[PDB]
């Protein structure tokens, strides 16, 4: 629900307002969230 | 008796970014399936975080070469998403469509030398307030800096911090006023051994807490 | 932080490397389904038009963001300013079908006509770049959202609803010629 | 104080397929009873599934006659609901008012020969990608085909499959481009015995999973 | 309820919006649903 | 059937102080934090109560000097938030934007003399109804008055009451009619000892129950 | 909620009608409310 700011439900049903998806996964979030961080090797703080 | 209303003035006109939706005309359409389609991204900043992109140094090369001199300033560029060295990066490619930003910006330095050459580099973040940026490491060593050698692991990541008065900062140099509101960054070369031509590739990407705020489009058509 | 660069694995080092502290971040404005959901003009207007989201200017916000993804899918919303009746046909109707009233025909109201169109293409996801041909550059003829016809269209605006993007591509910024950085006017209070 | 509203712009105009209903003027009308009236249908595709209809071969005959030759290609037609052989069928009569289709299409071959004549036929579905359609069964036998003899049961049903890249396909040949996007179908005659004039009637109907998607009307008035 | 996409009930009653049917069966669905399928005779898969 | 409405006449026009809100165009904006920012005020009258401000006596001095005479009337000013002596105070600065007021008004007298000088002052509130304001304490002593000496504590606070017929009173002298609807206030000097030049500073502020009622703006632009 | 006189909730959400504050105190009321009052010293009523 991006960029929609009406509190009340839509007046027309979900079948007429937009198309309906059928069936029979966000990759770059998984990639950027598993990015290596911290340090490498030893450390002398 | 029927519901009385008051058709207000000034309301209703089309605002090209209004948050309400239109009236349908054509219903009961089913799309073909696209479950688990590969390679989807939902936030531009995730893409900018996961994929570094090269900068643009002199003559349009993404690398700085080791120099034989007594001056050991490899390069210097403003911390501004409109800078000349960042004109080709994906990060600036996004940030040109936004008004303000905030957060850290990562720089990745990758050495590309042969096994028989060594070098030791240093990067320092010179904040604003100094009239002339430093030209030697003995002088710039007092800022926030980092040094690294060349060995097995050939990469180094430095997080240009966000240190500024206002919590958000513009992404465009305002006017013919000079001395960028955010300070410069200077990449120096402390010393080198038998690396006459071997280079250093520099790339830049987003940080763990980068954020762009207000959408615009300044590109003239 | 140090790593093997040639591995191409992502490395996101934070400020805590040298005593800092990462702050909280809010990334609503750089969300795809949000940033793509706003009206943009189409500058290819004729008596008849084939609604193709690749006629948007390659530098505007929605346009240049759409050209930065290989595959995309979204329903549409259009705002047309016309004289006479506006007839729409889905993806694949013969051109002559644009001349009958059995198809969705909007009779003009005073300001303009604002319609909502569903995704009608037969491909599961559309594309902005197509490597190859489709006959036995240009994308195939089946990468569009239908066609509209009126006596004379004056202005057409499109809006992508439920946007979904896949497989990003290079996105560019305006080159700096000789300056140290790009310098332009910023809005400032008068006097 | 009364409810304030904002009369929006661009909304309200008549869309000839709008999903809302008008205002009545004349009420309390009771219709005459029609309970259990015979012969009702509620979906066009059910009618198209339950009632086969003939094709249109050369000179407008729905039958192909056994030929005495060394060339044993009885007929060949494109798999397209606009094809010339399907110009008279009910199935194409519906599909001319729709934009896209998907599913299998059944063909019914009925022999009409005398008891003292035999024949053995073969039908093959040649997908797109070949420049010249095959002209002999030895060559077309590699496609998806079916063979049948003539005996007590005189009918044979072959389900032209839906095999194509896009999940839906158009119901109109686009432009002067040739070599239909969906492949041809070739009905061959392997051999015949003492059937000099006896015919074979061909009809076509919908499949178990045929589906038409988007309503239009391209017929000029 | 073919081609009607309003969520709220009609404002006018069922007596005024349309006529009212009186009393005192879908054939072709029954015909097409009982269509013979499968095979006939023997089978050597 | 759709909801019938009746677009009323006379309603809807923009009233620059209407209590309803507009339609947004730009969403999801987060402000920078300002928790516990110092020095916030939420009511103008609190500020007017906590911070006294000086008056404007002759020649624009906020003090009255001890006079050597047989006439011991130091000063006299009308109780009206438009008076000449109150033209510079913050209290009148607010009250010029309001139609009516009600409540008590505090006056703070601070002595500024040297340690070797004494004085004894008296302030009286002369209500309206007398033709000529009194010119001597023997005569004004019959009103509501207060007397005070000079010693360690150098300040004195007198609460000009609100005594009038109508529960609220205007904040602007109506017309060329004289003899202000609310009475005067006279600050007298009973006697003094060796205070030839030493002064008395006068300031004014709001009371515990001051209240302004109706917003206007009469300042011409 | 100064100078707003609608009984029904706003039609648009709190995110679109106005900006949203973030976090990580009325002074002059505290100053004026602690003002010294009454008298000072002795009293002979």
Q: Of chain B residues 64-83, which have a CB less than 8 A from chain C? A: 78, 80, 82-83
Residues in chain B closer than 8 A to A9 (CB atoms): none
Count of CB atoms within 10 A of residue B79's CB?
Answer: 24
Overall resolution, Å: 3.6
A5 within 8 A of B19, measured Cβ to Cβ: yes
The C-alpha atoms of residue B121 and residue B134 are separated, in whole angstroms, by 16
Residue F198 CB contacts under 8 Å (≥ 6 apart), including other chains: F65, F66, F111, F112, F113, F114, F117, F119
- Between the CA atoms of F124, F127, F128 and F133, what dihedral angle is there, to the nearest 10 degrees? -20
Residues in chain A closer than 8 A to B40 (CB atoms): 25-28
Residue D36 CB contacts under 8 Å (≥ 6 apart), including other chains: E25
The C-alpha atoms of residue E24 and residue D11 are separated, in whole angstroms, by 45
Mutate to test the interface with D, among C86, C92, C125, C145 (most CBs of D within 10 A): C92
Contact F13 B11 (CB under 8 A): no
Count of CB atoms within 10 A of residue D79's CB?
Answer: 23
Could you tell me if F15 lies within 8 Å of chain B, comparing CB atoms?
Answer: no
* A-to-E residue pairs, Cβ atoms closer than 8 angstroms: 12
B66 within 8 A of B198, measured Cβ to Cβ: yes
CATH number of the domain that residue G22 is part of: 4.10.90.10
F12 burial level (CB within 10 Å; 0-12, 13-18, 19+): buried
Residues in chain D closer than 8 A to E29 (CB atoms): 41-43, 46
* Method for this entry: cryo-EM
Chain F closest-CA separation from residue B2 CA (Å) = 6
Give CA separation, B174 vs A39, B80, B98, B131, F73, in Å: 38, 11, 14, 19, 64
Residue carrying structure tokens 């793509």: C36
3-class SS of residue F85: coil
What is the total residue count of chain D? 221
D70 within 8 A of D116, measured Cβ to Cβ: no
Mutate to test the interface with C, among A5, A10, A15, A18 (most CBs of C within 10 A): A18
Residues in chain A closer than 8 A to E7 (CB atoms): 9-13
- Please give the DSSP secondary-structure letter assigned to residue F64: E
The C-alpha atoms of residue B189 and residue B191 are separated, in whole angstroms, by 6
Residue carrying structure tokens 């056994």: D66
**DSSP of C62-101:** HHHHHTTEEEEEEEEEEEEEEES-EEEE-TT--GGGGG-S
**Chain C interface, Cβ < 8 Å to D:** 79, 89-94, 96-97, 99-109, 111-115, 120, 122-124, 135-136, 141-142
F157 burial level (CB within 10 Å; 0-12, 13-18, 19+): middle
Give CA separation, C30 vs B27, C53, E8, in Å: 31, 21, 36
Contact C13 A37 (CB under 8 A): yes
G45 within 8 A of F57, measured Cβ to Cβ: no
Dihedral (CA of B76, B80, B82, B87) sign: positive
Residue C122 CB contacts under 8 Å (≥ 6 apart), including other chains: B32, C91, C92, C142, D100, D166, D167, D168, D169, D170
Residue C27's closest CA among F139, A30, A29, F121? Answer: A29
Contact D4 B8 (CB under 8 A): yes
Residue G29's domain spans which residues? 1-45
The C-alpha atoms of residue C35 and residue B42 are separated, in whole angstroms, by 10
Percentage helix, strand, coil for chain G under 3-state DSSP, each rounded to 5? 25, 5, 70
For B100, the closest chain F residue by CA position comes to: F29
Chain A closest-CA separation from residue F22 CA (Å) = 14
Could you tell me if A5 lies within 8 Å of chain C, comparing CB atoms?
Answer: no
Query: What is the helix (H) or strand (E) element at residue F48, kind and residue range?
Result: helix F44-50
- Please give the DSSP secondary-structure letter assigned to residue A17: H
3-class SS of residue G15: helix
- The total domain count for chain A is 1
The C-alpha atoms of residue C126 and residue B32 are separated, in whole angstroms, by 11
For A3, the closest chain F residue by CA position comes to: F27
**Per-residue H/E/C for chain D:** CCEEECCCCCCCCCECCCCCCCCCCCCCCECCCCCCCCCCCCCHHHHHHHCCEECCCHHHCCEEECCCCCCCEEEEEECCCCCCCCCCCHHHHHHCCECEEECCEEEEEEECCCCCCEEEEEEEEECECECCCCCCHHHHCCCEEEEEECCCCCEEEEEECCCCCCCCEECCCCCCCCCCCCCEEEEEEEEEECCCCCEEEEEEEECCCCEECCECCCCCC
Residue F210's closest CA among F83, F104, F133? Answer: F104
Contact G29 F33 (CB under 8 A): no
Residues in chain F closer than 8 A to E10 (CB atoms): 1
3-class SS of residue C157: strand
D178-210 per-residue burial string, b: 16 or more CB within 10 A, e: under 16: eebbbbbbbbbbeebeebeebbbbbbbbbbeeb
The C-alpha atoms of residue B44 and residue B92 are separated, in whole angstroms, by 12
Q: Of chain E residues 1-45, which have a CB less than 8 A from chain F? A: 10-12, 16-17
Could you tell me if B175 lies within 8 Å of chain D, comparing CB atoms?
Answer: no
């Amino acid at each position: 629900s991006g960029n929609t700011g009406s509190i009340i439900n839509n007046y027309y049903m979900q079948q007429y307002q937009n198309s309906m998806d059928t069936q029979l996964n966000d990759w770059f979030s998984k990639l950027a969230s598993s990015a290596f961080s911290g340090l490498f090797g030893a450390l002398l703080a | 008796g029927i519901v009385p209303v008051a058709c207000s003035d000034g309301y209703g006109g089309l605002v090209t970014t209004d948050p309400k939706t239109a009236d349908p005309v054509y219903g009961k359409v089913y799309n073909p399936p696209r479950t688990n389609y590969p390679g989807r991204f939902t936030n531009l900043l995730d893409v900018a975080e996961a994929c570094p992109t090269f900068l643009c140094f002199d003559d349009g090369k993404p690398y700085v070469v080791t120099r034989e001199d007594e001056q050991r300033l490899l390069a210097k560029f403003d911390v501004s998403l409109a800078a000349k060295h960042m004109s080709n990066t994906y990060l600036s490619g996004i940030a040109q469509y936004y008004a303000q930003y905030s957060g850290t910006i990562n720089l990745h330095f990758m050495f590309t030398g042969s096994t028989d050459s060594k070098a030791r580099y240093m990067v320092a973040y010179v904040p604003p307030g100094v009239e002339t940026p430093p030209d030697t490491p003995e002088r710039a060593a007092h800022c926030i800096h980092a040094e690294w050698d060349t060995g097995l692991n050939s990469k180094f990541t430095f997080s240009i911090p966000y240190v500024s008065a206002a919590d958000y900062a513009y992404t465009a140099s305002d006017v013919a006023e000079t001395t960028n509101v955010q300070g410069w960054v200077c990449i120096y070369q402390i010393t080198h051994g038998k690396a006459q031509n071997d280079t250093l590739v520099v790339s830049v990407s987003a940080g763990k807490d980068f954020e762009l705020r207000l959408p615009i489009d300044p590109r003239t058509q | 932080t140090t790593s093997a660069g040639e591995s191409a694995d992502p490395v996101t080092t934070t400020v805590e490397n040298y005593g800092g502290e990462t702050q909280v971040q809010r990334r609503h404005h750089t969300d795809v389904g949000f940033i793509m959901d706003r009206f943009v003009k189409i500058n290819n207007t004729n008596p008849t038009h084939v609604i193709d989201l690749m006629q948007t200017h390659q530098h505007g916000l929605v346009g240049a963001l759409l050209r930065a993804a290989t595959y995309y899918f979204s329903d549409l919303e259009i705002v047309v300013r016309h004289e006479g009746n506006l007839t729409w046909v889905p993806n694949g109707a013969p051109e002559a079908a644009l001349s009958n009233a059995g198809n969705p025909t909007a009779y003009n109201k005073a300001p303009f006509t604002r319609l909502a169109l569903p995704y009608t293409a037969p491909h599961r996801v559309l594309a902005t770049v197509y490597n190859g041909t489709s006959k036995y550059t240009q994308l195939p003829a089946s990468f569009n959202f239908g066609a509209i016809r009126a006596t004379d269209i004056s202005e057409l605006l499109v809006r992508m609803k439920r946007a979904e993007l896949y497989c990003p591509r290079p996105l560019l910024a305006v080159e700096v010629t000789a300056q140290d950085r790009h310098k332009q006017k910023i809005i400032a209070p008068a006097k």
